[PDB]
Amino acid sequence: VLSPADKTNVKAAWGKVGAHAGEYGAEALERMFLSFPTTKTYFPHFDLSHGSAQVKGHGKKVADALTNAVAHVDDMPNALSALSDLHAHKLRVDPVNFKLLSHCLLVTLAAHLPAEFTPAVHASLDKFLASVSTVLTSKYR
Amino acid sequence: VLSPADKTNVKAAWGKVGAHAGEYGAEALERMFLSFPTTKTYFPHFDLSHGSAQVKGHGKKVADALTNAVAHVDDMPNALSALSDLHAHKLRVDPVNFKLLSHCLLVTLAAHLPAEFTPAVHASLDKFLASVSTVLTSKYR
Amino acid sequence: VHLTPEEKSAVTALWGKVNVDEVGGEALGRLLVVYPWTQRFFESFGDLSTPDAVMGNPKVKAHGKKVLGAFSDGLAHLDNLKGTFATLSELHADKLHVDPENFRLLGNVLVGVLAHHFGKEFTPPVQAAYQKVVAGVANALAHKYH
Amino acid sequence: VHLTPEEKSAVTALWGKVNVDEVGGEALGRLLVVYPWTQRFFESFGDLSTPDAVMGNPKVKAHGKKVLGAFSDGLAHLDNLKGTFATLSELHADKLHVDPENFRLLGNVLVGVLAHHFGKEFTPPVQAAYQKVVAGVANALAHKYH
Ligand code: HEM
Ligand code: HEM
Ligand code: HEM
Ligand code: HEM
């Protein structure tokens, strides 16, 4: 469960991201595709080239869902319910990949937040991403 | 989350395990130790030879806790409370090993319950073990 | 992989008793039941509505037999799985787009079926050797992923 | 491990800038903060109760430098991680009893710290080369587990 301190840390760091949420989302994807090439099997329909508008576009959507998640930290399952459905019954991404994107999102935040990414904040974000991943995979079976 | 059908499939199969619960637990552990040797790092204080009293005891403690979990499926978080704490603060087993032990418990069930291990039962059991695994690791951080 | 001679013999001995068609169909079916997300690739096989339906779908069973037939073939080259599977590796990554995690899921379902089929003859040491083979086949298959 | 000219140049060049002492203490400290169950191996190190306590604990800092100094020597032997880490593997499995999963956790955390420290210079492709490296190291340290 996210502790009051964790909820606090998450709101404080995400806050800081602000309107860069989108660019950060795209860089997290690029990091994922290059670091973990099996994840590209889910996007045979995209141009995965550096600078791809498709990646940008998809980065922005992911980013906006996490924004929605942050705002609804006390009620995640409802807020992400359409997304849970989607991933569970249409996309059908193996649960394993969620750890991978989470890692790359953390990496992107660390590279962008020199002051804010303290050990404490790092632990709270990790816990928040694992929580987001849990909700997204909750209706799989 | 467990469907009501999953709850039925689980009580059905475990009922079947009955008195052999302890023997199946020792066997699950022996399978774990041979198949996944990094798990042995958690028992450097144990005599791990075949049929050792220590393996047999732990086996029985493991089965009792699973029995307790089947008995209180609608209330796992409460029923395994003490065990969540123990694994969280004292034992601190990396969460990955729970999947390994789960797999070996599944294998042992398959080997012992020819008539009951249907595809639907198989699925409910895997979710059940995954749920137990989730409860035991829930207080980790 | 690095199987000792005794391990190699255990594996080949048990494999001698397998009806590949039957077990192929069963392992694929249980894959699709236990981890339904793996269904994503089989939209063209038809009806995967219930466990009964998956298990009974002839398309599933025919795929089960081809997959396990290649597996069976690979047991003849335990000393060179990467070589044996290089071409299938390429096909799976480049045309089929199958995340190599499914290879790991199939291998653990495979072991379950072997245990359900063979009961007490599937001892712990026997499981340990099939565990090395399945991890080895999954690694050879994931090799050409780039 | 297998690194392209591109990737090898990237790893060595960034490493040149790393103060092993500073980065090693940080990487170990964040490991025990982020995944607290890893504290199980460091009972004699002191108070590890809260973040501030971990980070400025002298035994943590010390141990961080040792581990990273060993990691560094491995970078000079990208071609034979296995023989380079054979002794340490045996130590970790036999004497310290450390689940090799922790090597994977450390590796992820080190990537994080290198990102935090280097910012935009730690680009996607650089990340990528470091990810193969930490996975190679993790696998070379898990080699002697029996
Ligand atoms: C942080 C966890 C994730 C979040 C918040 C997330 C969020 C989303 C969103 C908002 C969409 C678009 C839905 C719509 O169009 O309204 C989407 C689609 C999709 N997601 Fe997820 N996702 C996550 C993880 C993943 C992972 C790990 C993968 C696989 C590597 C994945 C693969 C995709 C695919 C392939 C699509 C469809 C892309 C398209 O064809 O437009 N997602 N995701
Ligand atoms: C289905 C999952 C599991 C269940 C239900 C479970 C249950 C138990 C129980 C009932 C105890 C004894 C508590 C007592 O004495 O008060 C125990 C202890 C312990 N468990 Fe867990 N366990 C599980 C998974 C694991 C895993 C995955 C590992 C490591 C590979 C592990 C390692 C240990 C150790 C080493 C002990 C202490 C043994 C001794 O010193 O007597 N457990 N567990
Ligand atoms: C032991 C693991 C596996 C082996 C040896 C294997 C083997 C093969 C073989 C030999 C083919 C046909 C190649 C050809 O037509 O030349 C094939 C095709 C296929 N495989 Fe795999 N496979 C494995 C696992 C999987 C898994 C886990 C999935 C996904 C859930 C999968 C999905 C497919 C699909 C979608 C096709 C194409 C079917 C068609 O077009 O009829 N395979 N596989
Ligand atoms: C992954 C890269 C790692 C490398 C290269 C490595 C290297 C080392 C070295 C050089 C030593 C000193 C041993 C000697 O006396 O010869 C050591 C000790 C030790 N390592 Fe590792 N290590 C690694 C990871 C870890 C991890 C992740 C943990 C656990 C979380 C760990 C737990 C220990 C402990 C408990 C000791 C002994 C400390 C003491 O003496 O109290 N190591 N390691």
Curated annotation (Swiss-Prot), chains A, B:
Mutating S131P leads to what result?
A: In Questembert; highly unstable; causes alpha-thalassemia
> Reported effect of changing L125R?
In Plasencia; family with moderate microcytosis and hypochromia
Outcome of altering E27V? In Spanish town
Instruction: Point out the annotated site residues (description: (Microbial infection) Cleavage).
Output: 8-9, 13-14, 24-25, 29-30, 45-48, 52-53, 55-56, 59-60, 91-92, 106-109, 121-122, 133-134
Impact of changing D47G on the protein? In Kokura; also in Umi/Michigan; unstable
One of its GO biological process terms is:
hydrogen peroxide catabolic process
Q: Name the consequence of L86R.
A: In Moabit; unstable
The glycosylation sites are K7, K16, K40, K61
Q: What is the effect of changing G57R?
A: In L-Persian Gulf
Q: Which residues carry this modification: Phosphotyrosine?
A: Y24
Impact reported for L34R? In Queens/Ogi
Q: What mutagenesis or variant effect is reported for P95A?
A: In Denmark Hill; O(2) affinity up
What tissue expression does the UniProt record report for this protein?
Answer: Red blood cells.
Q: What is the effect of changing K16N?
A: In Beijing and
Consequence the record notes for mutating K139T: In Tokoname; O(2) affinity up
Q: What is the effect of changing A130P?
A: In Sun Prairie; unstable
Q: Tell me where in this chain the PTM N6-acetyllysine is found.
A: K16
Query: N6-succinyllysine occurs at which residues?
Result: K7, K11, K16, K40
Q: Which UniProt keywords apply?
A: Acetylation, Disease variant, Glycation, Glycoprotein, Heme, Hereditary hemolytic anemia, Iron, Metal-binding, Oxygen transport, Phosphoprotein, Transport
The consequence of A26E is: In Shenyang; unstable
User: Is the keyword Cytoplasm assigned to this protein?
Assistant: no
Effect ascribed to mutating V1E: In Thionville; O(2) affinity down
The record gives the effect of mutating D6V as: In Ferndown; O(2) affinity up
Misc remark: Gives blood its red color.
Write down what this protein is called. Answer: Hemoglobin subunit alpha
* Organism, scientific name: Homo sapiens (Human)
UniProtKB/Swiss-Prot annotation, chains C, D:
Gene Ontology annotations of biological process type: blood vessel diameter maintenance; carbon dioxide transport; cellular oxidant detoxification; hydrogen peroxide catabolic process; inflammatory response; nitric oxide transport; oxygen transport; platelet aggregation
Give the matching Gene3D superfamilies. Answer: Globins
Effect of mutating H146L: In Cowtown; O(2) affinity up
> Where N-acetylvaline occurs, residue numbers?
V1
Q: What is the effect of changing H92N?
A: In Isehara; unstable
**Listed result of changing E90K:** In Agenogi; O(2) affinity down
Q: What is the effect of changing A129V?
A: In La Desirade; O(2) affinity down; unstable
Give the result of E26K, as annotated.
In B-THAL; Hb E; confers resistance to severe malaria
Q: What happens when you mutate Q131P? A: In Shangai; unstable
Documented effect of changing S89R: In Vanderbilt; O(2) affinity up
Q: Which PROSITE patterns match?
A: GLOBIN (PS01033)
Additional detail = One molecule of 2,3-bisphosphoglycerate can bind to two beta chains per hemoglobin tetramer.
What name appears for this protein in its UniProt entry? Hemoglobin subunit beta
Question: Which species is this record about?
Answer: Homo sapiens
- Gene transcribed to yield this protein: HBB
